[model samples]
Target: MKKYTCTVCVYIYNPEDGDPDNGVNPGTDFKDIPDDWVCPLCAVGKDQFEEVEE
Candidate 1:
């Protein structure tokens, strides 16, 4: 997933950084996203995110 955006909060998923909660880093990759990874804001989950089709 090159680009992902949350539909609920509308916060874009940063491919290389965590929400200051210890889940990612500056050099992080896609598949490495920990299982607990989430929207990082509001109450939205990664499931609410989707590839920016347009």
Candidate 2:
């Protein structure tokens, strides 16, 4: 499975976490993030996400 790392803090959002109402959720497709969805940790936009290969 693929993972996502926050560019601001290197925080990894794993799929096991599921969808978080206030935090970065799992199964959140990078391309499908809403424009209003902000990073819970750094408050950064979705554009700051980087895909991780495992």
Candidate 3:
């Protein structure tokens, strides 16, 4: 799973760990997260999070 960085907080979202705070389980990719989900750190919308280079 690809990782993403929160533009506002620099929160590195690792799919292997998922966003447990948002009920996102392991293996869930960024594209699979709910549209209403936001960054746990900055609380910014999902749109503000972008992919990180592998």
Candidate 4:
């Protein structure tokens, strides 16, 4: 799975290690997360996230 970074806080969301604290299960893809989910760090929405360039 690809990683996405929160533009607001530079928080990286790794699909292999989902945000368990936020109810996201491991192996969950960024596109598969709930639409209401926000960045665990800056609390920014998915709209603020961008795919990492490997």
Model 3 lDDT tens row, 32-53 = 9999988887788888988998
C-alpha lDDT values of all predictions: 0.65, 0.68, 0.87, 0.92
How many collisions between residues are there in candidate 3? 0
TM-score of 3: 0.89
Report the C-alpha lDDT of model 1 over 1-54, residue by residue, as the tens digit. 366778878687666554546547665654566766777676665667777655
Error of 2 at 40 (Å): 1.2
Candidate 4 lDDT, 12-51, residue by residue in tens? 9999999888899999999999999999878889999999
The runs of at least 3 residues in candidate 4 whose Cα sits more than 4 Å from the true structure, single-residue gaps closed, are none
lDDT of 3 at 1: 73
Best by lDDT: 4
Ten contiguous residues minimizing lDDT sum, candidate 3: 38-47
TM-score of each: 0.62, 0.62, 0.89, 0.92
When sorted by lDDT, best at the front, the candidate numbers are: 4, 3, 2, 1
lDDT of 1: 0.65
List, residue by residue over 28-54, the lDDT tens digit for candidate 2: 665555677766678787688788976
TM-score order of candidates, best first?
4, 3, 2, 1
